[PDB]
């Protein structure tokens, strides 16, 4: 948590979640009536340190 080891950890976790979604989609290819998943990401609150 130096504010740069947390921000990059968050990105790593997001990419891992996306990979989990992709692996779930690929594993369920042979199932009947399966609707594929799609991962959506949004950036959290940006912090303002000093006004323009």
């Amino acid at each position: 948590m130096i504010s740069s080891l947390w921000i990059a950890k968050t990105g790593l976790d997001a990419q891992q979640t996306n990979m989990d979604v992709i692996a779930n989609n690929l594993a369920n290819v042979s199932t009947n009536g399966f609707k594929r998943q799609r991962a959506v990401f949004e950036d959290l609150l940006y912090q303002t340190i000093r006004q323009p």
Partner: protein, 250 residues
């Protein structure tokens, strides 16, 4: 002490701030419709008597990058992508009007269009679609709704998405990620941006993030080297003071 340590220390801390901005940009490398933040160091010279020898450094985020990102083809009639220099209009968190590029338009059970949970702003206030109806979005933003069960002859327009034109120098990213007009730009263009009839959207394609990887890599390498440099000085000053304190002896 010698306040030269307070210059290199500032240079080392602002480098960590720049790294925190760059890492935040890298985390959002897959966010749909994301605008990367620009980071730049700026030098402020301390004014006063005697040789103007001290010039501190402070990071700076001069707006964002407006270069359009990748267009992923998702065969979904609700996901739209905007022409370059274009923006979709949504209702912000505090009932205000904000701008975005995320075209992941969703339909609620009640029939209201939303983007990231914010209501979508149509030619006349938020857009409400007939409940549980198929939606097609035209090139100029017109919305056609097909009621299931009824024949395809029933397709009729319902509302038009508000599409605005704004450059990078006019918009500022608010704290919730939604862009809003800057003060100077708002004073000249009015409070609410009028819809531009020339803007063209594409249905079935979703715009990705414009985070350039090569610039990010180079920025992290340069930041690490600069931090190590400032750290050398922080060590030089320490030893110099340690020794200079001896003159106070005898």
């Amino acid at each position: 002490m010698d306040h030269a340590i307070y210059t290199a220390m500032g240079a080392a801390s602002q480098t960590l701030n720049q790294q925190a901005v760059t890492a935040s940009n890298l985390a959002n490398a897959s966010t749909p419709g994301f605008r990367a933040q620009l980071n730049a160091l700026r030098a402020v010279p301390v004014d006063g008597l005697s040789l103007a020898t001290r010039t501190l450094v402070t990071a700076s985020t001069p707006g964002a990058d407006m270069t359009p990102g990748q267009l992923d083809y998702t065969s979904r009639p609700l996901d739209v992508a905007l022409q370059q220099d274009g923006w979709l209009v949504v209702q912000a968190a505090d009932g205000a009007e904000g701008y975005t590029r995320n075209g992941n338009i969703q339909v609620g059970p009640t029939g209201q269009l939303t983007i990231q949970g914010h209501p979508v702003i149509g030619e006349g206030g938020p857009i409400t679609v007939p409940e549980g109806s198929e939606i097609t979005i035209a090139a100029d933003g017109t919305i056609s709704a097909l009621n299931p069960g009824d024949p395809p002859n029933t397709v009729a327009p319902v509302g038009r998405l508000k599409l605005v034109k704004a450059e990078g120098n006019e918009v500022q990213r608010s704290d919730d990620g939604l862009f809003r007009l800057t003060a100077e730009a708002q004073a000249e263009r009015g409070a609410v941006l009028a819809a531009d009839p020339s803007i063209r959207i594409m249905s079935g394609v979703l715009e990705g993030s414009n985070v350039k990887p090569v610039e990010a890599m180079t920025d992290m390498i340069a930041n690490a080297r600069r931090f190590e440099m400032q750290m050398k000085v922080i060590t030089s000053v320490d030893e110099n003071e340690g020794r200079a304190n001896q003159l106070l002896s005898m």
